[PDB]
Design a protein around this ligand. Structure first.
Ligand SMILES: *[C@@H]1O[C@H](CO)[C@@H](O[C@@H]2O[C@H](CO)[C@@H](O[C@@H]3O[C@H](CO)[C@@H](O)[C@H](O)[C@@H]3O)[C@H](O)[C@H]2NC(C)=O)[C@H](O)[C@H]1NC(C)=O
Ligand SMILES: *[C@@H]1O[C@H](CO[C@@H]2O[C@@H](C)[C@@H](O)[C@@H](O)[C@@H]2O)[C@@H](O[C@@H]2O[C@H](CO)[C@@H](O)[C@H](O)[C@H]2NC(C)=O)[C@H](O)[C@H]1NC(C)=O
Ligand SMILES: *[C@@H]1O[C@H](CO)[C@@H](O[C@@H]2O[C@H](CO)[C@@H](O)[C@H](O)[C@H]2NC(C)=O)[C@H](O)[C@H]1NC(C)=O
Ligand SMILES: *[C@@H]1O[C@H](CO[C@@H]2O[C@H](CO)[C@@H](O)[C@H](O)[C@H]2NC(C)=O)[C@@H](O)[C@H](O)[C@H]1NC(C)=O
Ligand SMILES: *[C@@H]1O[C@H](CO)[C@@H](O)[C@H](O)[C@H]1NC(C)=O
Ligand SMILES: [Ca+2]
Ligand SMILES: [Ca+2]
Ligand SMILES: [Ca+2]
Ligand SMILES: [Ca+2]
Lengths: 32, 612
């Protein structure tokens, strides 16, 4: 299960170089 | 005694021996899907954790035995949790439901402490020897707040901070530590939130934190590690174990983390349900959700009158009071699908229709005493609505599949069918035993009707046939002499006397899909499925229409419960011995019992019994 980690990922993902304030942010791939 | 570090990661909980060589061994648990928040009970050698994927809080001994799920209902994102080892209380913060709750460590006497003006609490720390608890709030303007451990005198300790995690108390040195997940540093302050200092500022992604002796321990998601440093200067850094990504929480297990004394440690403060620390090292008695503290400030009274509301897979209880106390979800196992609800105020038993298994069930509000009143063998039945004759001890229910009104005793024995017709489509139903009548919607093809009949199916009459599209819900008040219905197509709620006179439209605007109605005191409550709302109107006309609760999904029924006056109840002629009637006791005319029979039986010569 990744419900907790997914919620934390989407809460801090925009704090990443890729995000130039025009990001929905990449899909969560770290389940597992 | 030896000091151990416990960390959660994915679906495992692992223990690292600090005083020996670093030796990684997993806690032999089973059935964990995502272990997040950790604590322990030094007395019982018991570990406690929340599971965000199962929305549960569980506990077990360090050896895996006595696996117990102590909270399993009404959690969304329980990412904060702490053990009150003096009072033997379990505390938790739910970031999803915006609630800080408490119960006994075994789960009993669940209560909500903080719910108003609360936005996403996450990290929780307890100081039961002082009476204070501390927590971090994420949503909105992030802050670190403090309250008494009964929830009272809430205050904001640190208002200028980013989202924080790892709230940890250094009890020996009277200092608070946390990681800031937005400014990416580790800082500390005294217990008033003052004398702030940044402990370590060069860390890429500091997430978890704990404290022990002269050290702090943190985990960094970018460094993928558990590390230790000087708790005051941040230097003297070492790596405890690396190559660990997404460590959800870390915690030091040692007797020195759980010390001190308060008045709850002895005989639970002589509190009947909950002993709750408050400043300064004192306590107050607490009660389960919706209970009242008695005059002695020691015992608790269950709520006498309340509102029950149902969704697809939950049934909830709310009360009206001066605390604006939150609704709670009743911990009813064996509840899968609810479509309709009713309550027996004599035996305090809640009844519901389960449309997945096509049954009528009953249970206590604590989940126990589960029983199946109506069931189909594995032709086919399909209960649609139900209404309880509390005096005759009968359930009147509608079956969509067979289009009959059937009657069953609360022990499951069939009484019989009182309505069957070729054209009949009885759906909604409410019984008025005080006057010998039942009221039901007849969703006949092209002609939806509101009808009344005697409780034995005779004296059938159509009350209303015009102005109806989908009359989908009924309620009545025998005291005021009114009948109520909601039409889910015409998007309105109407009322009329039980005789079918004085029909008026009470509310016809700002409604999308009214699916249920109930009467509570002088108010009429209803539920709007599409708008996800509970609303009410003052039937005296004094106060305007009022919103009660919003954003409630999958609403199905609403049902008010009044404290049943036993002296008045025993005066109903069918209450004692069913008036001597074998099957149907109905009040007629000059308040006397007349016996009647279902449609498959005929009254016998004794005029008390039913035969073929
Ligand atoms: C009105 O409600 C009752 C349930 O409260 C309906 O079901 C009747 O329930 C009895 C058990 O209470 C069923 O009896 C079982 O049927 C098998 C097969 O025939 C038979 O060997 C035994 O009698 C067994 O216990 C019974 O099937 C069922 N009624 C019938 C005659 O099928 C009752 O049917 C409801 N009335 C209607 C018309 O919906
Ligand atoms: C697992 O531990 C439990 C509880 O004991 C706790 O942990 C122990 C290691 C010790 O630190 C105790 O002080 C703690 O309270 C065991 O519980 C009892 O253990 C004895 C011996 O096995 C057993 O005979 C009793 O029936 C147990 N009583 C209870 C409360 O269940 C439990 O047995 C331990 N399991 C194993 C694998 O030994
Ligand atoms: C139970 O708690 C109540 C509330 O504190 C106490 O009742 C009074 O409360 C006032 C404040 O509103 C106190 O200043 C008084 O001392 C209390 N008066 C009394 C004696 O009733 C009450 O004392 C508490 N104790 C019990 C056992 O009832
Ligand atoms: C952690 O660092 C402390 C620091 O102790 C003193 O702290 C004061 C105030 O910060 C400072 O002015 C002194 O110079 C410090 N003295 C020393 C000896 O550094 C150490 O005392 C601890 O031993 C350190 N922890 C460990 C385990 O090294
Ligand atoms: C770091 O810890 C070591 C051993 O405890 C010791 O040198 C001292 O306490 C700390 N170092 C400094 C520079 O203070
Ligand atoms: Ca929230
Ligand atoms: Ca921690
Ligand atoms: Ca009903
Ligand atoms: Ca209802």
């Amino acid at each position: 299960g990744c419900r907790g980690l997914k919620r934390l990922y989407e809460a801090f993902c925009k704090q990443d170089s890729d995000c130039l304030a025009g990001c929905v942010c990449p899909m969560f791939s770290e389940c597992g | 005694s030896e000091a151990f570090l416990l960390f959660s990661r994915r679906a495992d909980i692992r223990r690292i021996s600090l005083e020996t060589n670093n030796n990684n061994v997993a806690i032999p648990l089973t059935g964990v899907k995502e272990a997040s928040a950790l604590d322990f009970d030094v007395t019982d050698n018991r570990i406690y954790w929340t599971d965000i994927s199962l929305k549960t809080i569980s506990r077990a001994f360090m050896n895996g035995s006595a696996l117990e799920h102590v909270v399993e209902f009404g959690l969304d994102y329980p990412e904060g949790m702490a053990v009150d080892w003096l009072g033997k209380n379990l505390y938790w913060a739910d970031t999803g439901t915006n609630r800080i709750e408490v119960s006994k460590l075994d789960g009993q006497h669940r209560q909500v402490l903080v719910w108003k003006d609360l936005d996403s609490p996450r990290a929780l720390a307890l100081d039961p020897a002082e009476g204070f608890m501390y927590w971090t709030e994420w949503g909105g303007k992030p802050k670190i707040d403090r309250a008494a451990m009964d929830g009272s005198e809430r205050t904001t300790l640190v208002p200028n901070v980013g989202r924080a995690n790892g709230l940890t108390i250094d009890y020996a040195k009277r200092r608070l530590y946390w990681t800031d997940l937005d400014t990416n540093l580790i800082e500390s302050s005294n217990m008033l939130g003052l004398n702030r200092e940044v402990i370590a500022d060069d860390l890429p992604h500091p997430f978890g934190l704990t404290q022990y002796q002269d050290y702090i321990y943190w985990t960094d998601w970018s460094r993928r590690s558990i590390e230790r440093a000087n708790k005051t200067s941040g230097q003297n850094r070492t790596i405890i174990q690396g190559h660990l990504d997404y460590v959800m929480d870390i915690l030091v297990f040692h007797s020195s983390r759980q010390s001190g004394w308060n008045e709850c440690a002895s005989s639970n403060g002589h509190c009947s349900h909950l002993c709750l620390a408050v400043p300064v090292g004192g306590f107050v008695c607490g009660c389960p959700a919706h209970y009242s503290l008695n005059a002695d400030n020691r015992t608790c009274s269950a709520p006498t009158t309340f509102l029950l509301f149902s969704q697809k897979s939950a049934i909830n209880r709310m009360v009206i009071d001066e605390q604006q106390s939150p609704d709670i979800i009743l911990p009813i196992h064996s509840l899968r699908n609810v479509r309709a609800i009713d309550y027996d105020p004599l035996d305090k038993q809640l009844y519901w229709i389960d449309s997945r298994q096509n049954m009528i069930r009953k249970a206590q509000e604590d989940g126990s005493q589960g029983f199946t009143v109506v069931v189909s063998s594995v032709l086919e039945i399909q209960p649609y609505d139900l209404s309880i004759d509390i005096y005759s001890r009968y359930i009147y229910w509608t079956c969509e599949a067979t289009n009959v009104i059937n009657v069953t005793r609360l022990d499951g024995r069939s009484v019989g069918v009182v309505l069957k017709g070729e054209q009949d489509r009885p759906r909604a139903i409410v019984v008025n035993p005080e006057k010998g009548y039942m009221y039901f919607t007849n969703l006949q093809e092209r002609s939806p009707k509101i009808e009344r009949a005697a409780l034995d199916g005779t004296e059938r009459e159509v009350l209303f046939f015009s102005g109806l599209s989908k009359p989908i819900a009924l309620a009545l008040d025998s005291r005021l002499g009114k009948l109520f219905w909601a039409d889910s197509d015409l998007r309105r709620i109407e009322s009329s006397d039980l005789s079918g006179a004085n029909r008026i439209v009470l509310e016809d605007s700002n409604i999308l899909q009214p699916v249920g109605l109930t009467v509570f005191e002088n108010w009429l409550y209803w539920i709007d499925k599409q708008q996800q709302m509970i609303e009410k109107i003052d039937m005296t006309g004094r106060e305007g229409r009022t919103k009660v609760q919003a954003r409630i999904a999958q609403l199905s029924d609403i049902h008010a419960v009044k404290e049943l006056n036993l002296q008045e109840y025993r005066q109903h002629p069918c209450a004692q011995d069913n008036g001597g009637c074998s099957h149907i006791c109905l009040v007629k005319g000059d308040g006397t019992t007349r016996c009647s029979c279902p449609m498959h039986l005929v009254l016998l010569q004794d005029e008390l019994s039913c035969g073929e």
